[PDB]
Amino acid sequence: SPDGSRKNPARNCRDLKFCHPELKSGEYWVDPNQGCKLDAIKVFCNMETGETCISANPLNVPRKHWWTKKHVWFGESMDGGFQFSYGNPELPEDVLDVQLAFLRLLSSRASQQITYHCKNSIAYMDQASGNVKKALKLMGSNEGEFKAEGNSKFTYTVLEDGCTKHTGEWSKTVFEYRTRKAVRLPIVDIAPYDIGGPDQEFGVDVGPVCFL
Amino acid sequence: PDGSRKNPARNCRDLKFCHPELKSGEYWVDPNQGCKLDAIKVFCNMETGETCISANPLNVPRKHWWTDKKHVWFGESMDGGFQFSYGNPELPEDVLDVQLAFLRLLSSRASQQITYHCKNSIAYMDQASGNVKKALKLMGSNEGEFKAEGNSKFTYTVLEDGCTKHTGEWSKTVFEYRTRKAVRLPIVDIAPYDIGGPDQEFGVDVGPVCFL
Amino acid sequence: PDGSRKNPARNCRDLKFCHPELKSGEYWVDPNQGCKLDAIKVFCNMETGETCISANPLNVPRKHWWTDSSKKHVWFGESMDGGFQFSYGNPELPEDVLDVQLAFLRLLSSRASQQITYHCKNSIAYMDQASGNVKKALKLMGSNEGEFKAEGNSKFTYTVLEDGCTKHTGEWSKTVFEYRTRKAVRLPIVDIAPYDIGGPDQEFGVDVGPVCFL
Ligand SMILES: [Ca+2]
Numbered sequence: 001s002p003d004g005s006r007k008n009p010a011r012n013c014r015d016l017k018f019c020h021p022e023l024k025s026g027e028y029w030v031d032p033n034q035g036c037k038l039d040a041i042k043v044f045c046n047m048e049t050g051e052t053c054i055s056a057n058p059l060n061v062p063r064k065h066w067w068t069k070k071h072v073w074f075g076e077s078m079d080g081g082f083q084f085s086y087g088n089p090e091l092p093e094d095v096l097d098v099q100l101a102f103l104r105l106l107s108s109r110a111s112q113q114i115t116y117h118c119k120n121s122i123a124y125m126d127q128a129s130g131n132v133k134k135a136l137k138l139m140g141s142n143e144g145e146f147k148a149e150g151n152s153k154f155t156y157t158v159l160e161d162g163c164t165k166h167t168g169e170w171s172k173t174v175f176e177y178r179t180r181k182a183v184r185l186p187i188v189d190i191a192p193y194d195i196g197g198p199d200q201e202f203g204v205d206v207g208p209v210c211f212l
Numbered sequence: 213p214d215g216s217r218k219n220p221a222r223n224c225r226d227l228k229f230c231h232p233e234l235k236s237g238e239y240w241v242d243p244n245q246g247c248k249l250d251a252i253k254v255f256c257n258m259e260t261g262e263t264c265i266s267a268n269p270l271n272v273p274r275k276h277w278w279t280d281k282k283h284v285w286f287g288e289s290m291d292g293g294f295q296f297s298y299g300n301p302e303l304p305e306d307v308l309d310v311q312l313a314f315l316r317l318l319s320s321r322a323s324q325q326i327t328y329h330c331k332n333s334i335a336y337m338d339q340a341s342g343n344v345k346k347a348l349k350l351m352g353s354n355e356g357e358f359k360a361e362g363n364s365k366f367t368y369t370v371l372e373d374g375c376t377k378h379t380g381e382w383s384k385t386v387f388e389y390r391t392r393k394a395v396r397l398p399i400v401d402i403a404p405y406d407i408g409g410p411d412q413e414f415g416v417d418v419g420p421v422c423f424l
Numbered sequence: 425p426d427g428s429r430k431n432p433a434r435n436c437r438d439l440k441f442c443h444p445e446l447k448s449g450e451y452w453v454d455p456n457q458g459c460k461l462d463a464i465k466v467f468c469n470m471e472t473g474e475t476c477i478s479a480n481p482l483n484v485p486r487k488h489w490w491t492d493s494s495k496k497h498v499w500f501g502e503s504m505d506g507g508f509q510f511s512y513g514n515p516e517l518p519e520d521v522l523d524v525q526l527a528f529l530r531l532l533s534s535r536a537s538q539q540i541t542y543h544c545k546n547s548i549a550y551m552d553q554a555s556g557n558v559k560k561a562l563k564l565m566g567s568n569e570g571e572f573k574a575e576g577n578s579k580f581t582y583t584v585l586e587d588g589c590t591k592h593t594g595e596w597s598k599t600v601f602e603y604r605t606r607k608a609v610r611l612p613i614v615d616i617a618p619y620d621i622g623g624p625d626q627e628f629g630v631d632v633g634p635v636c637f638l
């Protein structure tokens with residue numbers, strides 16, 4: 001019987017939760033495509049919810065002046081930019097793709113949080129206008145974009161917003177996207193709008209993509 | 213496996229292939245495999261290999277449901293209405309969701325029948341006018357509707373039609389939707405058109421959704 | 425699993441991952457897992473790790489297929505006398521079982537690709553040398569309710585590997601098409617619709633290449 005060890009992975013964390021109810025939240029190995037056990041992925045299992053959470057690698061975009069107004073994709077367009085990747089970096093992309101496809105099928109929903117660190121850079125709401133027209137965008141895995149407004153199937157939610165004014169200091173805004181259409185996740189890129197001025201800087205902490 | 217609760221099969225088609233001696237009946241299957249605890253109870257047709265899952269409740273009682281012509285969704289709009297639900301109402305809705313998702317996305321084909329019980333209510337053909345303009349509609353599981361006419365991908369077929377006149381008596385019309393795109397099934401709602409008058413009544417018997 | 429009939433692998437990519445010493449060739453795989461008995465014999469490209477399933481039948485004979493008495497695309501399978509849609513896998517297995525094995529590969533692979541060859545006599549396949557344009561290019565039917573074309577939405581355009589059909593010369597030639605995608609439910613190709621057909625001197629045939637999943 002699977003037990004979530006590297007040599008004996010479970011199919012996902014929900015299976016571990018139910019078939020091994022004594023296990024606590026933490027690091028486990030899961031193998032959504034089953035078959036060959038060697039392409040298993042290392043995850044965090046939330047044993048309260050049954051969520052399988054896969055970390056981004058790299059987890060973070062360092063705080064820097066990145067760009068010198070329009071939305072600009074970090075991965076697509078910025079110098080030193082990269083798109084976000086998930087799961088054991090040593091695994092071929094196609095294998096990671098297949099694992100995510102199976103985990104999507106195994107799950108009712110997926111969610112992900114992302115943190116925008118800001119210095120003189122609006123992320124969501126602009127305190128002066130009270131509007132979100134300068135809000136950043138996120139790119140999903142199905143080419144779709146997650147936005148502040150527009151099609152309600154694709155809008156993100158904001159959990160805290162410390163970036164509403166240029167204060168010369170660092171703060172942060174936290175975004176979440178949650179959906180039943182798990183093909184849309186994980187987030188692969190980010191496009192700030194209020195960037196490019198000499199004293200504007202940002203960083204990013206990419207939260208894990210969680211499936212249940 | 214063998215189709216018992218302790219040893220469920222992936223689905224009925226596998227059970228037929230691997231155990232051709234088994235007769236049609238109740239079995240336990242586990243489309244998402246892995247941990248066996250979320251296996252579901254189904255009817256296996258062992259001649260076709262179909263996995264058939266019953267609605268629960270499967271019956272809409274015969275009643276005057278609507279008072280007021282236009283299509284009106286039973287589940288969406290009528291007092292006491294409900295959308296049709298499938299599987300062991302014991303398991304959480306999200307578990308059944310995933311098990312059904314495996315069947316909907318990875319089956320060859322699917323089919324489902326639904327029976328409209330009618331008193332003074334046209335269901336498909338209107339004998340007096342000679343047309344199907346008053347025909348009812350059905351709602352699938354992929355935000356699509358099944359109709360008497362229009363896009364031939366989404367038309368249902370009528371197996372018997374006893375609802376063609378207002379006679380003051382009870383009769384029935386039987387609808388089927390069959391598709392190689394099983395994401396479209398099961399049926400989740402019904403919209404009669406010829407309803408609302410003081411002597412008009414209907415009921416429904418929801419047939420099982422069957423996956424190959 | 426080792427890719428034998430009694431011990432089929434899930435697919436060729438798993439076989440490669442677990443057995444780097446295995447060479448390209450035929451093996452038994454079982455994408456739907458569960459019962460082992462409905463395993464399918466495939467070609468594994470062990471350089472890429474692709475699972476390749478051959479068309480059966482793989483050939484549309486070379487013939488005058490269509491009589492034009494009207495000019496538009498005409499689907500071979502849907503409209504032509506003796507036409508058929510393309511099927512894949514061991515015809516010893518039930519159609520529904522093959523569909524399911526294919527469905528696992530289509531939904532859950534990273535990528536898919538397929539080539540198809542149009543044999544032509546007095547029949548433009550893609551480029552029309554006389555006009556210099558692709559207005560007469562044939563179309564292909566995918567497995568997800570879409571079509572693959574010379575132009576339009578770039579997600580659904582095919583690519584042309586060689587094009588020998590650009591003139592009417594009274595001689596046989598061929599044009600080879602390929603469709604590659606990260607949305608594998610679009611494949612395999614199930615039908616073909618030539619445009620430059622139906623004239624009294626026009627003929628075509630088709631060789632359907634294997635559908636390959638990663
Ligand atoms: Ca595996």
Ligand SMILES: [Ca+2]
Binds near residue numbers: 242246248249
């Ligand atoms: Ca299970």
Ligand SMILES: [Ca+2]
Binds near residue numbers: 455456457459461463
């Ligand atoms: Ca099998």
